[PDB]
Design an enzyme around this catalytic site. Structure first.
Site, PDB file in Angstrom:
ATOM      1  N   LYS E  16      52.993  48.235  21.610  1.00 63.22           N
ATOM      2  CA  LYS E  16      54.114  47.436  21.131  1.00 63.22           C
ATOM      3  C   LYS E  16      53.649  46.045  20.730  1.00 63.22           C
ATOM      4  O   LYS E  16      53.923  45.573  19.620  1.00 63.22           O
ATOM      5  CB  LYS E  16      55.191  47.353  22.214  1.00 63.22           C
ATOM      6  CG  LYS E  16      55.844  48.682  22.532  1.00 63.22           C
ATOM      7  CD  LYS E  16      57.020  48.506  23.466  1.00 63.22           C
ATOM      8  CE  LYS E  16      56.555  48.128  24.856  1.00 63.22           C
ATOM      9  NZ  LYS E  16      55.926  49.283  25.543  1.00 63.22           N
ATOM     10  N   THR E  17      52.911  45.386  21.619  1.00 63.05           N
ATOM     11  CA  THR E  17      52.325  44.099  21.280  1.00 63.05           C
ATOM     12  C   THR E  17      51.384  44.233  20.091  1.00 63.05           C
ATOM     13  O   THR E  17      51.412  43.410  19.168  1.00 63.05           O
ATOM     14  CB  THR E  17      51.591  43.545  22.500  1.00 63.05           C
ATOM     15  OG1 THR E  17      52.548  43.103  23.470  1.00 63.05           O
ATOM     16  CG2 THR E  17      50.688  42.399  22.113  1.00 63.05           C
ATOM     17  N   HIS E  78      58.970  46.892  31.418  1.00 59.27           N
ATOM     18  CA  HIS E  78      60.175  47.691  31.229  1.00 59.27           C
ATOM     19  C   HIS E  78      61.411  46.974  31.758  1.00 59.27           C
ATOM     20  O   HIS E  78      62.496  47.065  31.167  1.00 59.27           O
ATOM     21  CB  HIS E  78      60.001  49.034  31.925  1.00 59.27           C
ATOM     22  CG  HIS E  78      61.138  49.976  31.714  1.00 59.27           C
ATOM     23  ND1 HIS E  78      61.435  50.988  32.600  1.00 59.27           N
ATOM     24  CD2 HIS E  78      62.050  50.066  30.719  1.00 59.27           C
ATOM     25  CE1 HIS E  78      62.484  51.657  32.161  1.00 59.27           C
ATOM     26  NE2 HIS E  78      62.876  51.120  31.022  1.00 59.27           N
TER      27      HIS E  78
END
Ligand SMILES: Nc1nc2c(ncn2[C@@H]2O[C@H](COP(=O)(O)OP(=O)(O)O)[C@@H](O)[C@H]2O)c(=O)[nH]1
Lengths: 126, 37, 375, 133, 387
Positions: E16-17, E78
Site C-alpha cells: 500500500k505504501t 489495520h
RNA sequence: UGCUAAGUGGAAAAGGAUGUGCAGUCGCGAAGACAACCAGGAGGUUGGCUUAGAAGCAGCCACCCUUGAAAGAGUGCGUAA
C-alpha cells in the site's frame, strides 16, 4: 567453597571416572536450567551429567589414567559419565545436540584411550 | 542539587568522589546529586 | 441500651454489620425547634403507620408476625420524641427480635425517615458525618487565650491560658510609654508562639481539619502566620469572635465552617469535571457501579438528593437498571440503591463525599454520581 | 502470557478474571466457555491455567494441577491456615496423606522419587503451620 | 477540477505504501509542473492524530491528474484503517484494494471490504500488486476470480476495473510498469464516479436556536448542510416532536441582511410564517418536503473508545442506555447487541441495534456519536433504518 | 631526618568524607582471589495471614524441600496486583 570444600569436591570427581565405563565431555553455555532437565531425564536410564571447575577436574583427573585429556578442559565444561553401555547415551546426546545447537561435544574416552568428536558420533550409529 | 554539611549515598548506586576541594555524591538518579557546603 | 457517642465512619461501618432475623427499623427524627415539633412528630407517626399498613397488606405468615412486631414496638416512637439530650437531630435503630435500640443525638439537622430493612440504614448518617467534621477554635486576647473544639454543631471548651509574659513595671526604673510598649510587644509575640504551639499539638492529637483563629484588629494575622506549613493552609480568620457568648460563638463558627465546606465541595466538583475526558473518572451510574464491583473507586461522589435505583445481582454485585452481566442472572431490583452504593464503597475502603447539589449543574449528564478510579 | 488460578467450573464471572484477561484483548466469553468445558469433572478443586496469547488475539491455554497449599487445607478440613506458624498449629496431617498429595502433583514436581516428592509437600505444610505426622 | 477523495485499503504488507509511492512518482514524472513526488519515508512515517481524542496514524498525499484533483489516504496499521473508516471526518468516494498476487486476500482484506460496504463508500476497484514477482498466469487468474467473487458477494461493483501492476519495479524506475501505474491513473479518472455536489442535494438544515426579535418574529437559525433555499418555498419541520409541521419561508436573513436564496454552508436565518417558538426547538430539521423522514429504531456500526483515549473502562451489555448524538442534539436509546455477542470491550468495533425514545431524522450513512456521563465514548455510522 | 599543599601556619561545635604518612591484628588467593566481559539465576509456589488488591519486594509469621554448578520463602527499580 573454601579450601576444605575443594578437597571434598575433588574426591567426588576422582571416583566418578573409576566407577564409570566411559566419559563424554561437552559444553553447556546457553542452556537454561529447564533445558538441562530435558537432557538429564533423557539420559537418566543410562548416564549421569555433571559440571565441574575446569582446573579442579585436572587435579581429580590425575588420580585416574586419563592423563591424555587435559586439553579438553578449557572453556565451559560439562562431562557425562556413562554407567551402562555406550550407544544408549550417545544417541540421546547426539539427538539433543542436533536440535539445540548450543550443546557442543569436545571428545570422549573409551577403551582406556582418548577419543575424538567424529569417533563418538559413529558410536551412536554402531 | 542538595547543599548540606553532610552528604551520603542515599541509594546503592551513589558514589562519593572528591572534586576541586569538595565532597560530592553522584548517581544516575538526579535527586541523589549533592555537594558539601 | 446504647446511646452512642463520638460517631465516626468506623462505628458506622461496624453498626451496619448488625442484623436481625425479622428485620431492623431505622428512624430519623427532625427535632429542629424552628420548624414546629408537633408537625414533625405527626409526620413520623404517619410514616410509621403507613409502614404498618404496607406490611399488613401482604398477609403472609412472616409478614404477619413481623407486622405484629411492628405494633409491639409502638411506644418506642414516643421515646424518640422525648430524647435523652437536646439534640436537633435524633436517630434510633431498633431490632425486631432483640431489645437493642441504638440511640444517637446530634446538632446537625436531619429529615424525617422511617425505613425497614435487614440492617441499619446508615446512609443519611454518613451524610450527617460529612457535614460535621471536627474543627478547632482559638480566641486570643491581650489578656488571655481560649481554645475550643467544634464538632457536629456542638462547641466544647478545651483550655484557657493566661498571659505568662505580662507584668506591671510600676515606674520603678525610669519607665516610659515606649519601653512599656516594647516589653508588651515582645511578651505578646512570645505568647502567640506558645499558643500556636499548643493549638498545633491539639490539632495533631484530635485530628482537627480546620482552625478558626480570632485575635482582633491587631493580633489576628500574626497568629495565622505562626502556624506551620502542614497547617497554615487550613486556618480561617475571623476578627470579632471575642466578646461573643456561646450561642453567637457557635453560630459564627458553624457558618464559617459551612462556607468552607461548600467551597471545598465545589472545588471537588470542578476537579471531577476537568478530569473527565482523560478516562480517569468514572461518570454515570453504570460505570460507577462497575468500578465499585471491581473495587477501583478511590473516591465516590454522589448527590444525596437524587433517588437512585438499580439492580442487585445474585452474588451481591451492583448493576444499573436493565444492564445485567451475561453470566449473572436472578437480578433482584433494589429501589434504595444509594445505601447499596455506599455500603459497597465502605466495604472496598473508599472515601464517601455526598455533594449536596452535584446533579443540578456540573454532573448533570452523569446524574450526579462519579468516582475516581484507582487505575 | 497470562498465568492465573480459576475455580473448577466458575470461570464465567468477569471482575476477578475478566479484566485480567481483557488487557491483552482476549474476548472473555469465548475463553470462559472453553475452560469450563475442559474442567468440569473436577468440581471442588481450584485449578490454575497458563494462557498463551498470540499476536492476532487468538489464544491457547494449558491446564495445571491444584496448588499444593490448597490440597493440604482440605486434607485437614480447616478453612484457613495459621497466621503465625511454628506457634499455633491449625491441624495435623498423617504422612500417608502427604504422599497422596505428592502423587497427584507428580506431573508438576522436580522429584523423580516418591520419597523426595513427599518432602517437598511436607515443607509447604510447615509454611501454614500444619503438623505432619 | 472537482477534487475527489480516494485512499488505499488492503491487507498489511501488500505494498500500500509502495503503491502510493509509485503513484506519486508517476504523476510527478508526467506533470512535474503540476504534481510533486512524495518520499517513501513520509508515506511509511504516518504522523499521529488525536482529533476528538481518538488516536489515528494517517499519511495524507495529494496530486492532480489531467481530469480532477485527487486526495490519497494511507495508514500503517489495520486499526488505523478501521478507526478512520468508522469515525470518518472525511469519507472517501472510492478506494483501491491493494491485493498482492503472492497470496491473494487474507482476513484483513475481507474486513476492509465489509467496512467499505458498511460506512457506505460507493465504489471499489482492485490493483493487484507484485505482478513482477509472480510469473504464473494461473495464479493471477485465480486471484482475479477470487477478488471478483469477493467484491460481487459484498454487493459492490461486479465489473471493477481490475488492473495488474508491480509497484516496486515501477517505483524503482522500470519503464515496463510506469505504463501500468499511469493506466491506474486513467482507470481511476474513468472510474470513481464524480460525487454529487452539496448544493445539488435537497435542502436540509439542523435547527440550532430559536432567536425571537421584534418586528420579524421567530428566526430559526442553523448552518445549511445540503442544498439551497428560496423564498416562498414550502418546507417541512421534522424532528423530535411527534408530529411534522408543514410551513413556508417568508425571508432568509444573513448577517442582518435579507436575501432571497441561501446555499450550503451559509449561517442562514430562516424566518417562517405561522410559526412560534413553541413549535421549533434545537434538534429538529428543516427539509425540502418529503425528502427525509423521522425514525426511532435503526442499526449501525460503531467503534467504542478505549480507556486511554478517554472512553469507558468496562464493557457494556444488552440494554446499555447511552446518549446518541445526531446533528445538534442527543436522545437516549437502548442498545441490543447481535446474536453471538453479549459484551463489547472498549476499543472494539461492532454492529448494534438502537431503539431511541424520541423520533429523529436520519438516513443511511449519517454520522452519530455516543455520549455517556457527558463525554464521548464511541462513534459510528447508520447502516439500516429498521423502522 | 621526616610531615603539610590547606597560605594550614595566621580563630570555632555536633557531625560529613576513597586527602595523606606510620604501626599493629584478620579474612580471601596460582585449587585463579578483587574488578570487568559471556551464560545460568529454576520447580512446589501466587508459602501462610491480612487486605479492595498484596503474586520475592505496604504490613505480620515462619524461612522448608527438591533438580542441581548455583539459584535467597529474595538486594534493589518497577505495576493498582
Ligand atoms: N515483490 C514485490 N514486493 C513488493 C512490491 N511492492 C512492495 N513490495 C514489498 O512489500 C512490502 C509491502 O509493505 P507495505 O504494505 O507497503 O507497508 P504498509 O503499506 O505501510 O503496510 C514492502 O516492504 C515492499 O518492499 C512489488 O510490486 N513486488
Amino acid at each position: 567453597m573454601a579450601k576444605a570444600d575443594k578437597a571434598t569436591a575433588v574426591a567426588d570427581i576422582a571416583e566418578q571416572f573409576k566407577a564409570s565405563t566411559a566419559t563424554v565431555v561437552t559444553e553447556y553455555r546457553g542452556l537454561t536450567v529447564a533445558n538441562l532437565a530435558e537432557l538429564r531425564r533423557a539420559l537418566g536410564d543410562s548416564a549421569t551429567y555433571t559440571v565441574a571447575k575446569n582446573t579442579l577436574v585436572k587435579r581429580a583427573a590425575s588420580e585416574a589414567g586419563i592423563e591424555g585429556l587435559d586439553e579438553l578442559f578449557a572453556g565451559p565444561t560439562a562431562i557425562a559419565f556413562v554407567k551402562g553401555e555406550a550407544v544408549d547415551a550417545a544417541k540421546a546426546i547426539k539427538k539433543f545436540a542436533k536440535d539445540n545447537k548450543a550443546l557442543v561435544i569436545k571428545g570422549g574416552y573409551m577403551d582406556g584411550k582418548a577419543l575424538s568428536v567424529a569417533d563418538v558420533e559413529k558410536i551412536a550409529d554402531l | 542539587m542538595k547543599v548540606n554539611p553532610s552528604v551520603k549515598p542515599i541509594c546503592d548506586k551513589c558514589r562519593v568522589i572528591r572534586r576541586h576541594g569538595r565532597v560530592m555524591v553522584i548517581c544516575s538518579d538526579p535527586r541523589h546529586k549533592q555537594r558539601q557546603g | 441500651m446504647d446511646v452512642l457517642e463520638r460517631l465516626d465512619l468506623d462505628t458506622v461501618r461496624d453498626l451496619s454489620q448488625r442484623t436481625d432475623r425479622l428485620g431492623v427499623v431505622s428512624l430519623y427524627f427532625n427535632a429542629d425547634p424552628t420548624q414546629n415539633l408537633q408537625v414533625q412528630a405527626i409526620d413520623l407517626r404517619n410514616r410509621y403507620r403507613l409502614l404498618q399498613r404496607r406490611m399488613e397488606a401482604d398477609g403472609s405468615q412472616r409478614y404477619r408476625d413481623v407486622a405484629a412486631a411492628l405494633e409491639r414496638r409502638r411506644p418506642l416512637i414516643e421515646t424518640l420524641i422525648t430524647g435523652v439530650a437536646s439534640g436537633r437531630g435524633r436517630i434510633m435503630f431498633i431490632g425486631l427480635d432483640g431489645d437493642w435500640t441504638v440511640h444517637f443525638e446530634c446538632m446537625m439537622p436531619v429529615t424525617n425517615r422511617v425505613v425497614l430493612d435487614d440492617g441499619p440504614f446508615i446512609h443519611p448518617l454518613v451524610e450527617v458525618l460529612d457535614e460535621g467534621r471536627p474543627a478547632g477554635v482559638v480566641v486570643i486576647s491581650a489578656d488571655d487565650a481560649r481554645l475550643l473544639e467544634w464538632r457536629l454543631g456542638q462547641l466544647q471548651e478545651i483550655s484557657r491560658i493566661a498571659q505568662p509574659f505580662g507584668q506591671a513595671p510600676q515606674e520603678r526604673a525610669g519607665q516610659m510609654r515606649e519601653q512599656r510598649q516594647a516589653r508588651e510587644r515582645e511578651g505578646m509575640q512570645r505568647f502567640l508562639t506558645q499558643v500556636t504551639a499548643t493549638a498545633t499539638e491539639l490539632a495533631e492529637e484530635r485530628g482537627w481539619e480546620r482552625i478558626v483563629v480570632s485575635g482582633g484588629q491587631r493580633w489576628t494575622e500574626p497568629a495565622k502566620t505562626r502556624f506551620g506549613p502542614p497547617l497554615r493552609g487550613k486556618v480561617l480568620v475571623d476578627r470579632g469572635l471575642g466578646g461573643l457568648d456561646d450561642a453567637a460563638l457557635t453560630a459564627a463558627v458553624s457558618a464559617r465552617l459551612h462556607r468552607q465546606h461548600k467551597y471545598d465541595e465545589q472545588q471537588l466538583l470542578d476537579y471531577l469535571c476537568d478530569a473527565g475526558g482523560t478516562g480517569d473518572v468514572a461518570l454515570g451510574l453504570s460505570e460507577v457501579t462497575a468500578a465499585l464491583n471491581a473495587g477501583r473507586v478511590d473516591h465516590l461522589v454522589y448527590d444525596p438528593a437524587v433517588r437512585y435505583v438499580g439492580t442487585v445481582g445474585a452474588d451481591g454485585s451492583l448493576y444499573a437498571d436493565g444492564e445485567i452481566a451475561p453470566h449473572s442472572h436472578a437480578a433482584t431490583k433494589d429501589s434504595r440503591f444509594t445505601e447499596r452504593l455506599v455500603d459497597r464503597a465502605l466495604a472496598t475502603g473508599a472515601r464517601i463525599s455526598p455533594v449536596e447539589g452535584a446533579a443540578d449543574a456540573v454532573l448533570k449528564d452523569a446524574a450526579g454520581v462519579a468516582a475516581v478510579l484507582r487505575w | 502470557l497470562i498465568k492465573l488460578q480459576i475455580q473448577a467450573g466458575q470461570a464465567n464471572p468477569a471482575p476477578p478474571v475478566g479484566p485480567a484477561l481483557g488487557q491483552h484483548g482476549v474476548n472473555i466469553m469465548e475463553f470462559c466457555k472453553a475452560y469450563n468445558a475442559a474442567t468440569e469433572s473436577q468440581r471442588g478443586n481450584v485449578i490454575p491455567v497458563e494462557i498463551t496469547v498470540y499476536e492476532d488475539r487468538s489464544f491457547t491455554f494449558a491446564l495445571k494441577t491444584p496448588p499444593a497449599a490448597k490440597l493440604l487445607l482440605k486434607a485437614a478440613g480447616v478453612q484457613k491456615g495459621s497466621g503465625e506458624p511454628h506457634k499455633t498449629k491449625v491441624a495435623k496431617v498423617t504422612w500417608d496423606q502427604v504422599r497422596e498429595i505428592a502423587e497427584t502433583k507428580k506431573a508438576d514436581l522436580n522429584a523423580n522419587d516418591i520419597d523426595a516428592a513427599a518432602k517437598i509437600i511436607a515443607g509447604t505444610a510447615r509454611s501454614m503451620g500444619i503438623t505432619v505426622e | 477540477k472537482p477534487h475527489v477523495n480516494i485512499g488505499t485499503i488492503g491487507h498489511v504488507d501488500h505494498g500500500k505504501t509502495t503503491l502510493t509511492a509509485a503513484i506519486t512518482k508517476v504523476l510527478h514524472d508526467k506533470f512535474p509542473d503540476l504534481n510533486e513526488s512524495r518520499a517513501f519515508d513520509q508515506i511509511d512515517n504516518a504522523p499521529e492524530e488525536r482529533q476528538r481524542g481518538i488516536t489515528i496514524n494517517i499519511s495524507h498525499v495529494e496530486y492532480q491528474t489531467d481530469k480532477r484533483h485527487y486526495a490519497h489516504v494511507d495508514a500503517p496499521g489495520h486499526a488505523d484503517y478501521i478507526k478512520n473508516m468508522i469515525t470518518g471526518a472525511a469519507q472517501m468516494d472510492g478506494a483501491i484494494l491493494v491485493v498482492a498476487a503472492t497470496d491473494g486476500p487474507m482476513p484483513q482484506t475481507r474486513e476492509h471490504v465489509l467496512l467499505a460496504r458498511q460506512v457506505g463508500v460507493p465504489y471499489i476497484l482492485v490493483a493487484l500488486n507484485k505482478s513482477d514477482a509472480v510469473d504464473d498466469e494461473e495464479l493471477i487468474e485465480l486471484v482475479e476470480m477470487e477478488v471478483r467473487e469477493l467484491l460481487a458477494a459484498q454487493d459492490f461493483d461486479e465489473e471493477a476495473p481490475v488492473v495488474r501492476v508491480s509497484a516496486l519495479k515501477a517505483l524503482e524506475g522500470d519503464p515496463k510498469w510506469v505504463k501500468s501505474v499511469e493506466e491506474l491513473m486513467e482507470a481511476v479518472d474513468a472510474s470513481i464516479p464524480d460525487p454529487v455536489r452539496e448544493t445539488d442535494k435537497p435542502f436540509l438544515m439542523p435547527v440550532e436556536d430559536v432567536f425571537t426579535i421584534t418586528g420579524r418574529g421567530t428566526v430559526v437559525t442553523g448552518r445549511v448542510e445540503r442544498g439551497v433555499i428560496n423564498v416562498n418555498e414550502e418546507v417541512e419541520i421534522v424532528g423530535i416532536r411527534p408530529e411534522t409541521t408543514k410551513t413556508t419561508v417568508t425571508g432568509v436573513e444573513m448577517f442582518r441582511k435579507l436575501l432571497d436564496q441561501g446555499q450550503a454552508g451559509d449561517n442562514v436565518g430562516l424566518l417562517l410564517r405561522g410559526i412560534k417558538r413553541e413549535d421549533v426547538e434545537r434538534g429538529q430539521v428543516v427539509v425540502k418536503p418529503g425528502t427525509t423522514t423521522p425514525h426511532t429504531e435503526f442499526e449501525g456500526q460503531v467503534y467504542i473508545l478505549s480507556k486511554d483515549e478517554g472512553g469507558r473502562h468496562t464493557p457494556f451489555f444488552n440494554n446499555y442506555r447511552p446518549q446518541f448524538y445526531f446533528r445538534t442534539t442527543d436522545v437516549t436509546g437502548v442498545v441490543t447487541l447481535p446474536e453471538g455477542t453479549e459484551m463489547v470491550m472498549p476499543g472494539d468495533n461492532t454492529d448494534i441495534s438502537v431503539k431511541l425514545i424520541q423520533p429523529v431524522a436520519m438516513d443511511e450513512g449519517l454520522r452519530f456519536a455516543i455520549r455517556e456521563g457527558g463525554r464521548t465514548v464511541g462513534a459510528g455510522r447508520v447502516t439500516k433504518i429498521i423502522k
